[PDB]
């Protein structure tokens, strides 16, 4: 029982991307993590210099 970003239930069938990726209730959640890791990794070097 490892850590699964999406639902690990139903034999880990939440990663299926039929009927468009945007209709995957977990992939849209994944798309919302990139804008934050982008800034968290662009500014950390900049702030650490300061």
């Amino acid at each position: 029982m490892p850590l699964a970003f999406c639902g690990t239930e139903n034999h880990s069938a939440a990663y299926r991307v039929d009927q468009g990726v945007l209709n995957n209730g977990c992939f849209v959640d994944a798309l919302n993590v990139v804008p934050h890791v982008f800034l968290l990794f662009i500014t950390f070097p900049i702030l650490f210099i300061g």
Binding site: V17, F27, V33, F48
Partner: protein, 56 residues
Amino acid sequence: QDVFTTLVDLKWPHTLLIFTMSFLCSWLLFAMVWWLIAFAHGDLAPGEGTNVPCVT
């Protein structure tokens, strides 16, 4: 604005932190890219490899 002068002026322990962060962030920024590309492609699903994975 004098970033490359500033980086040299910093003490060595600070330089190690910036050296580490500049590479850890780069590795992890593209870690989200590879994870998401393989998510969108659909080869992340734990099933029989009917397709050809985007990155094996």
